[PDB]
């Protein structure tokens, strides 16, 4: 049962440094080589850093090199990957690969066959924000504006009803403020019939805001 | 300083349909080349490395080829759980990825429902105003909205987003974003979402006057 395990991801400030780790199970550490994998949202996978099983060899992206520190202990089984001088272009997804296959020489290129679950890296100026809650056939929905950091949950009387809701993915403003979208498509004989409430969730700022969905 | 590039970037199919994907490099890689799919909120799996050797446990319907600076990924018959975007990875110099091929669901051609909502009373009171058009289950993704202030299209003060295909339905949904100052919002009368997609004969407009 091979699996790697991530751990170290969070919330720094644009100049500020944060350190990943992975622990490795189920091989051969010393063997195998490992690597540092990020894809940012909304764009392709990039490789970012990688690191010999044995040699110590090290290689680095094109985009962050000079920035990053890879390292592993073997002897503990675990690879860690220091973010020095972090901006938003950082902010990414960050894996922890595997080097498929074998090699027979003491450091080389190669695939990645087993994958980490993935740790979350966001790099930004945070002003925590709460959010923003706003109110034939007509649809109707809410308007959650401004708030920070990620998620948020939208469910509709108390996740009853379902069928024809498209919650949408969120977009990030120059301000650094999230925004989305929660529709829903009914009738409009029904609007002093049926009652909608949306119900919007923030966990990190333990805040819930309720605004009913009235004819107006 | 290998860079990877695949064709095409999107394409939509249906179950059983013959699926080639192509990815280039810049440089000769001879045969170091992997190919990987990874579906939304998964990790990647590995499904071919060696340009032609496919990885355990992936279906037999998947098989890879080619060598030099032209490969091809092909899926005999494309199945259900083939819905995703692949990857392929060359590892002959460093280590560098395609852009990515998005293999869409295909569906029949769905028009969009179009709505616009003005701001609501408690944003306005905030000094803030958004006004949103909506464009919901449509298809294919390829879609264009336009924004009209007093009938004067808008540019560059939008932003959009879309959904994945409904597991149901196979349509896509869109929301686009027009932020103004509360200011700017109240110096004019009717605000315009106008839409022009290929399931609509002709564009769309909807339309009010703030009263």
């Known amino acids: 049962q091979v699996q790697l395990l991530e751990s170290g991801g969070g919330m720094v400030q644009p100049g500020g440094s944060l350190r990943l780790s992975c622990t490795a199970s189920g091989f051969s550490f010393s063997n195998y080589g490992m690597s540092w994998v990020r894809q940012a949202p909304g764009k392709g996978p990039e490789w970012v850093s990688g690191?010999?099983?044995?040699?110590?060899?090290?290689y680095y992206a094109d985009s962050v090199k000079g920035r990053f520190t890879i390292s592993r202990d073997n002897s503990k089984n675990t690879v860690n990957l220091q973010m020095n001088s972090l901006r938003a272009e950082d902010t990414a997804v960050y894996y922890c690969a595997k080097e498929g296959g074998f090699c027979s020489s003491a450091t080389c290129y190669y695939y990645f066959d087993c994958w980490g679950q993935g740790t979350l890296v966001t790099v930004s100026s945070a002003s925590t924000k709460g959010p923003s809650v706003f109110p034939g056939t007509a649809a109707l929905g809410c308007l959650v504006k401004d708030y920070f950091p990620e998620p948020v949950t939208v469910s509709w009387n108390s996740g009853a009803l379902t069928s024809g809701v498209h919650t949408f993915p969120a977009v990030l403003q120059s301000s650094g403020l999230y925004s989305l979208s929660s529709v829903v498509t009914v009738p409009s004989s029904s609007l002093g019939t049926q009652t909608y409430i949306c119900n919007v969730n923030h966990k990190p700022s333990n805040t819930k805001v309720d605004k009913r969905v009235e004819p107006k | 300083d290998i860079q990877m590039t695949q064709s095409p970037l999107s394409l939509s199919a249906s179950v059983g349909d013959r699926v080639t994907i192509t990815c280039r490099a810049t440089?000769?890689?001879?045969?170091?080349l992997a190919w990987y799919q990874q579906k939304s909120g998964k990790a990647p799996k590995l499904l071919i490395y060696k340009a032609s050797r496919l990885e355990s446990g992936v279906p037999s319907r998947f098989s890879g080829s080619g060598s030099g600076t032209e490969f091809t990924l092909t899926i005999s018959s494309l199945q259900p759980d083939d819905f995703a975007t692949y990857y392929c990875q060359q590892y002959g110099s460093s280590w560098t990825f395609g852009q990515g091929t998005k293999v869409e669901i295909k569906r029949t051609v769905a028009a969009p429902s179009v709505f616009i909502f003005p701001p609501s009373d408690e944003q306005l009171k905030s000094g803030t105003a958004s006004v949103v058009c909506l464009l919901n289950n449509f298809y294919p993704r390829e879609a264009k909205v336009q924004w009209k202030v007093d009938n004067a299209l808008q540019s560059g003060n939008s932003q959009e987003s879309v959904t994945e295909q409904d597991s149901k339905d196979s349509t896509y949904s869109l929301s686009s974003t027009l932020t103004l100052s509360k200011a700017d919002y109240e110096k004019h009368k009717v605000y315009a979402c106008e839409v022009t997609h290929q399931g609509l004969s002709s564009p769309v407009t909807k339309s009010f006057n703030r009263g």
């Open positions: 440089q000769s890689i001879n045969n170091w």
């Open positions: 690191i010999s099983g044995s040699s110590g060899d090290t």
